[PDB]
Design a protein around this ligand. Structure first.
Ligand SMILES: CCC(CC)O[C@@H]1C=C(C(=O)O)C[C@H](N)[C@H]1NC(C)=O
Length: 654
């Protein structure tokens, strides 16, 4: 039951005094406050409410909950005379704007004297819960005499003045329980999640979204289910999928599509504090960075990077493919426990040969890289993680796999690429096929540029974007995917050259990519990817040197009477921020008129990896990482990868 409830309080930084209403309501000193609000202006630091000693000399004696112009939700609880100052927050907790309108968010705070915790909720998620040693509730702070909506009274002056409308605000004089407040903060923002923490995947975290629309009208998503926080490495990562048969309104519950089980797919509470957030799951085989394409025959492909357990993408050897050439064929090498050389190969039917004697052994490797001996599976114990992080054997047996820490036979500790095909628009998938040593025997595979591949219309060539760190690697097939080759293109510098393709006209394609110079590069081919021009750079996007992944797609419908492309990227030198969608119209000479752009949220809000698809109804689907995924400060955060949609008319505005 609320001790005070107020409605539709509209404010422009001046606040509203509710001292009369709230003084003498807080017996224990504990509290819960639930605020449904929208901001009319995001700028500066804004308190939703403030409880304070207003008297001169007592400006550090207050409790508040605040919003920043980057979408961070926090709270302070301070006492002046004891010099105790508590701050609890989480980045990227709220939404600012959406299609020109202030977004309604619902956030809450809980202060619990027993547990000595402050908890913050936003939009259905508990964004942070922190035990504090210098715990302060309202009674602990000396001489509280002022209770305020939309600010904090410090020394008789309004501070942190809120700009917007408090739609509903509820003050309770006790700590409400976790699930009550999760339900109270649930709203329309909550339904923009396709993948959620501890859903059917078992993962608390996700990164690297991909959207694709199939020819039958299904909209398909894939994503990294990253179990040990959001680290790229070392980590345990599965690729999950989920789809919509109604233009994105509703989505299937996620399935695991690419996954190993040396570790179980289970939720882990990954520490965000400075001294824990660098921790990693050491030793777990991984699929990472998905790429999707639909063939002309309606069969679907999906590619992914494959990392054996323990193998950091910077301790992975770079001068070994993992393959041997024997009598003109390529066979994946294996090392047996206790050997120093790689004496064995996987050949026909998965039969393991001793290369020295050139004879088949009793061992074989199945379609999923699992090891058998005389037709019976070898096993290893699966690992679990508990927290002070420990990794231990949990008593469950899973198949021994050549990608594992504890395998009798092991692949070269480097990165690989695998692909799976589906004949039923992603309801079921073939077993994984590892790509051949397309870069050469004495080089490791490239790394995929996440998003989609394309079928170039004039040749039917399939093109999959990848990179080496020094070169673009344009993986292609000229035989409807039966065989694979690569065009390697030296870049001007050490670009993490994540790319996506667009066709401009028949035979003519462009690869748009990330760079290490702050700009988006694009390379043009006028022979369907066989040869590539020197790079050019977009003049209107300006990012940090490290760069971010982008999304660009072809669009089926004319815009202003012209063939169009649609680009999504952050655009900011301050971080992975300021998401924009750009409409480019193709001219008769194949130059692009970049005529329209739309800012996804306010400029200082988080926007990292993103994916665009055209919906069957010709609206646009976007899923994106609504946080800064480079920042060491915005790691291991739950429920931060939403799906939103636009009409062309929406994307014309800004
Ligand atoms: C960490 C290596 C790579 C650069 C070569 O960074 C990429 C950057 C990423 C990023 O900047 O967010 C995420 C990618 N998933 C990652 N790729 C892999 C394979 O780990």
């Amino acid at each position: 039951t609320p001790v005070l409830e107020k409605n539709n309080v509209t404010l422009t930084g001046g606040g509203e005094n509710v001292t009369k209403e709230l003084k003498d309501k807080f017996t224990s000193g504990d509290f819960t406050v639930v605020i449904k609000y929208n901001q009319s202006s995001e700028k500066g630091l804004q308190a939703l409410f403030g409880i304070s000693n207003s008297k001169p000399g007592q400006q550090n004696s207050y409790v508040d909950v605040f919003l920043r112009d980057n979408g961070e939700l926090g709270m302070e609880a301070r006492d002046t005379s004891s010099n105790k100052n508590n701050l609890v927050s989480r980045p990227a907790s709220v939404w600012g704007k959406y299609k020109q309108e202030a977004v309604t968010n619902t956030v809450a705070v809980v202060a619990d004297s027993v547990k000595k915790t402050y908890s913050l909720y936003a939009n259905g998620t508990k964004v942070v819960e922190k035990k504090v040693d210098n715990f302060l509730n309202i009674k602990d702070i000396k001489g509280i005499d002022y209770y305020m909506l939309g600010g904090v009274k410090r020394a008789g002056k309004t501070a942190f003045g809120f700009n917007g409308t408090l739609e509903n605000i509820k003050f309770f004089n006790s700590a409400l329980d976790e699930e009550t407040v999760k339900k109270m903060t649930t709203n329309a923002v909550t339904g923009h999640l396709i993948y959620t923490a501890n859903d059917t995947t078992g993962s608390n975290y996700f990164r690297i979204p991909v959207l694709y629309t199939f020819s039958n009208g299904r909209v398909f998503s894939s994503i990294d289910a990253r179990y040990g926080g959001t680290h790229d490495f070392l980590n345990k990562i599965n690729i999950a999928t989920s789809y919509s048969d109604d233009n994105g309104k509703t989505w299937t519950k996620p399935k695991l599509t690419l996954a190993f089980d040396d570790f179980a797919p289970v939720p882990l509470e990954w520490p965000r504090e400075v001294g824990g957030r660098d921790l990693q799951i050491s030793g777990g085989a991984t699929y990472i960075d998905s790429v999707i394409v639909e063939k002309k025959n309606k069969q679907v492909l999906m590619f992914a990077d494959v990392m054996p357990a323990g193998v950091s993408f910077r301790e992975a050897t770079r001068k070994d493919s993992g393959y041997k050439q024997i009598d003109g064929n390529y066979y994946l090498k294996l090392r047996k426990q206790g050997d120093t050389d790689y004496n064995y190969t996987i050949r026909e039917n998965g039969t393991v040969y001793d290369d020295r004697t050139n004879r088949p052994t009793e061992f074989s490797v199945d379609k999923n890289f699992g090891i058998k001996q005389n037709g019976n599976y070898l096993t290893v114990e699966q690992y679990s993680v508990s927290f002070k992080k420990t990794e231990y054997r949990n008593g469950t047996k899973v198949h021994m796999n050549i990608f594992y820490k504890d395998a009798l036979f092991k692949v070269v500790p480097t990165n690989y690429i695998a692909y799976i095909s589906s004949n039923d628009h992603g309801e079921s998938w073939s077993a994984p096929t590892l790509l051949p040593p397309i870069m050469g025997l004495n080089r490791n595979a490239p790394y995929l540029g996440p998003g989609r591949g394309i079928i170039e219309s004039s040749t039917g060539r399939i093109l999959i974007p990848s990179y080496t760190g020094k070169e673009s690697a344009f993986i292609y097939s000229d035989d409807n995917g039966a065989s694979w080759k690569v065009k390697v293109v030296p870049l001007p510098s050490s670009w993490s050259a994540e790319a996506q393709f667009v066709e401009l006209s028949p035979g003519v394609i462009q690869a748009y990519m990330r760079t290490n110079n702050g700009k988006i590069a694009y390379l043009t081919s006028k022979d369907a990817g066989t040869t590539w021009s020197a790079p050019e750079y977009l003049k209107f996007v300006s990012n940090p040197s490290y760069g971010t992944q982008l999304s660009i797609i072809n669009y089926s419908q004319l815009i202003d009477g012209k063939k169009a492309v649609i680009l999504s990227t952050p655009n900011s030198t301050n971080g992975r921020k300021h998401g924009q969608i750009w409409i480019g119209l193709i001219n008769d000479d194949n130059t692009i008129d970049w005529r329209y752009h739309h800012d996804v949220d306010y400029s200082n809000y988080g926007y990292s990896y993103s994916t665009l698809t055209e919906l069957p109804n010709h609206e646009i689907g976007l899923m994106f990482e609504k946080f800064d995924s480079w920042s060491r400060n915005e790691l291991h955060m739950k429920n931060v990868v939403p799906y939103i949609t636009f009409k062309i008319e929406d994307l014309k505005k800004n």
